[PDB]
Each structure stands twice: as C-alpha cells, then as structure tokens.
Write a protein that binds this DNA or RNA. Structure first.
Ligand SMILES: [Ca+2]
Ligand SMILES: [Ca+2]
Ligand SMILES: [Ca+2]
Length: 94
DNA sequence: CGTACGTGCGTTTAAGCGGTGCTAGAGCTGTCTACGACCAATTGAGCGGCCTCGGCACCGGGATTGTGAAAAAAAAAAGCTGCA
C-alpha cells in the first residue's frame, strides 16, 4: 500500500524483547526504571553481564523512538519507562 | 532477596637483596665576642581597697509559633473476578 507504507516490522533482538517482557512483567505503576529492569534482567542465564546493561540502554532508546515504549520523566538516570504500545497504531507510522 | 565480598587459581610485577660508587651534609673542633646573668639604685605600673550607677536578671503581659486532634480527601493498596 503506497511507498514507505505497510512496512516489514522486523522482530526486535533478544535484549529489546527482555526490556519489554521485564517492563510488562513488573509494570503496574507510574514507570519502570533502567536500574530496576536490570536488577532481575540479569537473572536470565544467557544475559551477558559485562555488556547487557548497555544493550538494555540501546533497546530502551530505540523502543521509545519506535513509540513501542514511553518515558514518564526519561532524561538520563531513573527515566522510568512504561510500554505506551497499548493505545497506538501497533503497525507503525512515520 | 540481591549481590558484595571471600576464595582460589594463573599471570604479572616490582620488592628485596647484595653490591658498588659518589659525595651531601652530619657533626666535630677550636676560636672569639655578642649577649645574657647578676647587681644596685631608681621609680612608676599594677596591686588591693573602695565607691557608683547602669547592665542585666527577673517579672508580667501580649504577640507569635508550632503541635496534635479530628474530619475529609487523595492515593496506594489489596482482594476479587472471569477470560484467554
Ligand atoms: Ca542489599
Ligand atoms: Ca656545616
Ligand atoms: Ca580594681
């Protein structure tokens, strides 16, 4: 349907998935923080201890831009990120 | 319940050792006089004694500040549902 419309929607990577799973899994409040999600994110056996935190940082920055996720205050530290996916297109928009 | 610490490995580092070589500077000696003790005479700073009057302790009255109770809202929290 037209040009740059009805697009691929490439499935996110295992860390970007873990960020979303973890945010919903313990999410019933006004925001889930970077440091919070990291705390039991690393409980997962395949999680790369040395870099994982940085991967989760890449994910959250991209998920917010995607409009998959949204920040309650979300500048640098604390941030707090609620999945804003609920009331949206869900299919992508420019 | 989360992870900071303790353990134990293999790998890396530089302390420790014994030695040599060089000389700064610690420390000793001898000399000589500037400086401090000691003294006697002089006298004025600082002592005790004494008097006074204004600060400050104490009081009463009023202004002000902070606390706690009760009632009522805002909010998290909890237990309760069917679905999916
Ligand atoms: Ca702790
Ligand atoms: Ca000397
Ligand atoms: Ca006096």
């Amino acid at each position: 349907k037209k040009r740059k419309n009805s697009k691929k929607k490439n499935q996110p990577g295992k860390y970007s998935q873990l960020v979303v799973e973890t945010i919903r899994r313990l999410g019933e409040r006004n925001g889930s923080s970077l440091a919070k999600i990291y705390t039991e994110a690393k409980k997962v056996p395949w999680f790369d201890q040395q870099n994982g935190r940085t991967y989760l940082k890449y994910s959250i920055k991209a998920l917010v831009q995607n409009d998959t996720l949204l920040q309650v205050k979300g500048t640098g530290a604390n941030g707090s990120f609620k999945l804003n996916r609920k009331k949206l297109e869900g299919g992508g928009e420019r």
